[PDB]
Design a binder for these strands. Sequence first.
RNA 1: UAAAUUAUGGUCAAUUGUUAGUAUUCAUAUUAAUUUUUUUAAAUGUUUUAUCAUUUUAUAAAGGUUUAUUUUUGAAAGAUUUUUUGUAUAAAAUUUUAGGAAUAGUUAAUAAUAAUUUAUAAUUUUGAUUAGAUUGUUUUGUUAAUGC
Lengths: 190, 213, 143, 360, 213, 110, 49, 51, 104, 255
Amino acid sequence: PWWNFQTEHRQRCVMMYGGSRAKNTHNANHRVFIKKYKRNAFPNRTRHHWAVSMTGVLGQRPRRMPWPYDLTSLIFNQPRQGSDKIGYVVGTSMLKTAVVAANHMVYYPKFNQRVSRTSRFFAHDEDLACVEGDLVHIKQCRKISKYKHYYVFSILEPNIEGRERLKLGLKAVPPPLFGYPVSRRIVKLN
Amino acid sequence: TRLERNKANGGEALPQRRLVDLPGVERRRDLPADPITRLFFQHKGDHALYYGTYDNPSLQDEDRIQIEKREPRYWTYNVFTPVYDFCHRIREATEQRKRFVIVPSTVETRGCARVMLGHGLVAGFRDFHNDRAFAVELKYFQGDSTINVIEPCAYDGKTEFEWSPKMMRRLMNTHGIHNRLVVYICRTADNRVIDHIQAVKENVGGRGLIMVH
Amino acid sequence: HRSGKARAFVFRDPTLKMMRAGSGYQQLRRMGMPIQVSKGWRKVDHFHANNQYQHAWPLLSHDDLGNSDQSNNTRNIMYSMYLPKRNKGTAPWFRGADTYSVKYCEQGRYEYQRYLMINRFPSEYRKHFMNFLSNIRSSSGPA
Amino acid sequence: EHPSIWLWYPWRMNPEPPTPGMPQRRALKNLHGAVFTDLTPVQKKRQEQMLYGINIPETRQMKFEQEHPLLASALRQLDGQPKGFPFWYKKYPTRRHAYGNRFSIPDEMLEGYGEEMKKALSKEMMSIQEKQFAQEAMYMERYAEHDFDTTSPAVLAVKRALKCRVLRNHLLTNPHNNIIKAVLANTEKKLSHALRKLRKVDFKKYWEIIRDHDVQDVLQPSNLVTYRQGAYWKYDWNAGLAISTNLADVLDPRGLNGCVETGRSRSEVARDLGLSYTRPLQENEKKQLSHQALYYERLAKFKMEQPEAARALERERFVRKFSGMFAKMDIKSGAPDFPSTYRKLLGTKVVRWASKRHGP
Amino acid sequence: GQYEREAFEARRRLEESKNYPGPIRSATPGDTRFYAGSLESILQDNDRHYWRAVIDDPQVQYVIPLRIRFKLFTWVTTGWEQRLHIVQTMAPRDITIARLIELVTIENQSPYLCSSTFTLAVDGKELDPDKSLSDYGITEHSRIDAIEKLDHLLHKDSERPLDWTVDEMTTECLKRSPYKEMGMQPQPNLAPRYEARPKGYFGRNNYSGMKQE
Amino acid sequence: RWAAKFYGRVTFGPRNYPYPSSRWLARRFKMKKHRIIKRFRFRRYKLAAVANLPFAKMIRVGLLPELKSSKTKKGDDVEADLSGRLVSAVRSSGGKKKGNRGRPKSKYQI
Amino acid sequence: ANHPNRQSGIQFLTHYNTHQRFRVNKDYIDYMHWGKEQGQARLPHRHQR
Amino acid sequence: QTWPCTSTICAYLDVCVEAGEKTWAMEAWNRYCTELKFLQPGEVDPKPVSR
Amino acid sequence: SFKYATKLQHDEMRQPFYIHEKRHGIFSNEKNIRKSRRGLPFITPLYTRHMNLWETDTDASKNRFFRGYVFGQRELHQLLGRPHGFEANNTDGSNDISAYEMTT
Amino acid sequence: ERGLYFPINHRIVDRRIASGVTVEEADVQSRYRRELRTSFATGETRQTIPPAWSACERPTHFLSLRLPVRNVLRTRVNEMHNQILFSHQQHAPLLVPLEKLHITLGVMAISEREETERLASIYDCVSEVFSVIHPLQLRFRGLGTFGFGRVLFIRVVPEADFGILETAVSKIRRRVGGELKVDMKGNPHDSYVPHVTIAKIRSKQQTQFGSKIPISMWVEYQHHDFGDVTFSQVDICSMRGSKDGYYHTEGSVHL
RNA sequence: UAAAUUAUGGUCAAUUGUUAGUAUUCAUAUUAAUUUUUUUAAAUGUUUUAUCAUUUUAUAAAGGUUUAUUUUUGAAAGAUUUUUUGUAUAAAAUUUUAGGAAUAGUUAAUAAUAAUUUAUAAUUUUGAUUAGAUUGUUUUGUUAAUGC
């Protein structure tokens, strides 16, 4: 067995008294990387590949991990994880549809520390109330479309500034000044 | 708990009225502190509405400097804390053979200080109710500091190290010899700040605050 | 070495090194943090059976399983050899019935059990309600 | 005539200028990075309202009257005459409120002195720092709660709004003073970080601010990269303003919540009580909805007078419900996103979709 | 039935009492559109997707879900078959059967069934197109049938469908209603593929309520 | 800058070496840099990058057949409009203009 | 520390918002003149200790 | 510790009937079905669902 | 800690079975046994745990993970208007209670 | 070819059909995407439902907030009427006149044998509530359906003063319902939805004009902004508009 | 801002290299291996049935996947004298590559609609789409041990 010493081994069939039966897999194997391309010729554009990958999920390293103990589990009891999610409703331009952006918990055991993470969800809102920014509660259901398994389960604060901005007519939120990051020196003059 | 069951027997049979006394004898005194040779005035208790907080202090002790907070800038920095800075105030002063240190004042900073003082690593401390600071008078021996080493449990604030009661029981067990030598300060769930010895005498573990010896 | 790895001016305290390891994967495991997504380990009749050793079976000395187990009686062979160990060479770990704390026997029944407030979706409340209804009216069909 | 091209020579430090070397004066972008070749007309009127000298508005006079009528009555009998006791001190509750002249010289002090002295200490000789600070105190006077608070959101927002205006007017006059670039940039970051609590504590002042200092560009989010996942919104959270709302006094808090027993939503309890929570919908959200409101009138006007076409599209759809790909319902069939539920089958077999993922 | 009868009894008594305040609409919950499971299921009119343990008020059912059992000629690829085709229409309680049948005409999505004008029936005797649903007693339970203008002819063999299993499909059949689309000669994909019931499915004779063999 | 200031870890001594870099390693890396600069200045290295290109993927103007220095090699394929821009601009950098901001005008520019 | 502007060292026993006395943007130490009264031009003055 | 509604008291009371033990029913009476009062002529018959 | 304590093939180093019953209702792994694609890689995620750990049930006074100021409680307090402070007088991370709870 | 295979728009499973019936016995093909349509897609404004007896009797007295002169609701309603007509000459005889305009905050079945005496105590309860209240500003935005499409009305939005107004009107509902046993329609404890009826199908037009106003006539305004307006007077009025246009002013309260 | 103990309570943490001025997880060690040794495997024809038919017997070939794989009694267990019901597709957390940017039968609502319905649609730098390696979340090895 594992707790036995190489030369004190006899029988790899059974474990006599007790312990842990397991196959001593061979982690020590010098996995390699066979260069099938040239440093200037890669069939990718963004992320080039030039050395072995560490593969897995719930196995990669730094060992990120699922942690339910976050804002959501501090505020709501849940039947099953992810049910209830609180966020700044951001993006509702799809008629009767909200995009609620609420966080989860990514715990790093090795470091002994956390980082909660962002996610733009789909969230049905029949009758079109929420505006971009209302801190809202979102709950899960039966699905609503390809992508919305949620529905606007409340408001926690309505963006009253925004609602009046619409009433007056303007855009309830001005749009971002710049786009996504590009690589071309776009020369805007006048 | 056994030294009270037969010390509280003094109940008369009647649930008698409780006696009224002088206007005030039940008020807590203030701790004496000379006003002219001093670090800070031991601020009274009556001004308990004048006291601000560590983060946001009042305007008291204009004669004296004020410690500043310890809050980093980026991702790439460790996030210090009063427990870190109090440990390295004390480490540098015991390395400079000072006497009084003006050490940050948070609930578990003076928590660590009251138990260090109970454990004799410190000749004394004082909370002047200074919303920001309080002073730790250091003890020396044979030229060398009694606080041989003093470490924070975490060089970071973003990493709280909750100690299992078994973790804290495997410190007082040096290879079969029960060893309460190195004193470890951990802040339990009850918002108390206690050494690992009373923490494992009641089998609760707490946030790791400091190691010291 | 402006471009070398950093080295501690002094060894860190090994006690601190231990205390920083109460929240890492190898203790999350034996807390219960993972949700087992696969078969996990090979429980039964794969090469590596676990569950037959999971409880305690006395010592089988029926033939030479290697150490002449059947006429050689193996006092010292069991300590050094088959009583499992804490790592290769460490002392025999004994999971005995006298190496567990005597507060374990003195417990009344089901006291370890704490009020578990479990909440289930609304529709899921309805489901399980109609189900234990149907099943108090009739559990098995005719029997 | 074509994208400007710089001829970098690698042996050198850095390139040559462009042959269409378009600009001459570097163009001065905002806090988050957009141009202004000058300030809005609001702000140029706010420059002429700063360099003509602001006079103390009569609101202070009238509040002093209907507030301290006894000091006013004393002044009422004492008007014009060389005063030896300050019957206006309660009118000027602080050094700074006396911005109508120089050196905090309150108006009712210079009577007996020379007209030339009154000319010397009037709004005509105020230094430029004096005049900027004068506007500052006047505005921090009419936006503050009590005349000693200078740390209110509105106080700070207006103070830094005037501040950033004088900064921009400095810059759009003198371009290469880039410590002052990093003056305006950080100052505007704080003015935004204050207005984004103002519009969370009382937006009325916020819009009076908006439309009197014409600064919406310092609230306007810059980078979609952030405001896609809602981080330009998280700020009024982080400051602690997620609940500085008073819905109990704007938006009737009854229907804004689901239930726990039911599980139904905000608008469905608003259904089961009959209340109308819905923003103003733009014309697009209006027309899509009117169109979704007439589909059944279309069905009734379709099947009833052209049941030929009703039947024709019957044939079209009735063949299609059997042709095509799938006909039964499996999870393989109706996993509600085929292309990404089945990744192993998109480049080789199922060339219908060109990418494995199209949604969140 | 012990439910329809009794709920009608009480639904009636409720208005046999004038001393009744009305329902507290905020406390009379609707049904939830979002629920657990997977589908957008429809429960009854009296039923909620959640638990509502109350015995809520038995309210009158304004629009009835009326079920009309048409006759759709199906094509198992071994003949044409007669099978039940209910079209459950949500129809009010005040409507004349004329408008009810206009309604079903608009409601169907298979115009295999609304090619020629048809009529209603209950246990045979037709309903007139001048009276209304309660004029006979149409609930959602009225075990209604539907009868086309050519129902008395389907024992016959003149308009009976000319199938390519046993009959000659000419070219003119290849431009007429079902057969232009039915897909006679199998494409590489067999393009519109239909059902298929064996020639020996039921046994030697066809489907009957009573045991023949 | 698009240039690499240090062509090499000039600063490498033991940590706390109270200087940016020892004069030895500085000379070693100035020799590497003299080789790089003479390679560039002598193969008449010319690069370029114009607006609304992916500015990271540089242009090799010295690898154009109109400005080629080699004869047996083929420099690079470049669209015709962009080529007529660039090589005209390379000719344009052959002189500095009185009445404008002057420039460092080298022989190896032509 | 052998970098210039790191000779000030680690002073945890100052008041400043840092322990790294060379990162305190506040009181850059004159090096030639101070120290007559406080030891070295690093340590804080005897009216701020 | 649950509150047997009228239906449930009736139910258990049938049970007491059939088993023939008055004690069994007297406590359900003492405990729960005491504040049950007949419908006095003025008051509404089926007071609506409230919660 | 040690190896034999990391070896999860003993049970004492494992949270027992009956806790998936105490969580998802007794005998509710069976309805997943009887499932179709049960066994190829995945199974129904078996929720054996300590009960004192559930994100569902427990609170900041039970679960030592809940009073993590770094990201959990800090946002809790920036939401609940409490004074959140690093080494706070209240163990979770709160300096004291907020205006709302103070009053109501 | 342009969407999912088995869309969840059509993913439906009706459970008022018995079990097995759709399996092997019978087909139930219908159109379920109109019985699963939302009040936001129809217009069902959940009006307080009167029970049997109070439904049998006609509204006799009704509390209403009066519109001031020179409104915005009046002018936007005027253009809505212009477009109703230019759309259809059919629909003029269904619209409510502009002068009959009011704001309905409650209807009440009052008996004439105890008529004026009950009106007086009701007036006490109304003035004792609206005495300390300030003049009320409300929001008109987007119409709805009373009587299952029979009545079209410009609901006042709950977004400016519905909180205060409904504390008031549920107080006076409780008072008129449980204190002085008058018949407000619903429960003494319900809150009647304040409403501005702009058109209606009346029993005298049911026969010819229908039991559901044609949602095509008005649905372009179902979510239109009709204006925010201020008002100062809550009046109990008897149901007789032909007096001078506006219904018989059986009591007023200024704010 | 109090000491306390009715005396080891609750069950083992413990690091074993001959270096070569000094800075630095970095040749030589030991542990688990692999290189290495035939004490675990193995066969063909599945089997009934009334019969040219039909009842019974459902995840190992690869197939290249990192926003991914999920589902029931109606089969069977399964018991009676008959018509007998409401529990399922959904998710949620974690996702690689030095030099990092655009991708597409598209997103939502209507729909048991629209191969030409409506629209300011959706994915993305919180690192998207292409391409590359790769089987995805109680099995080991080392270490006193977070790890690796």
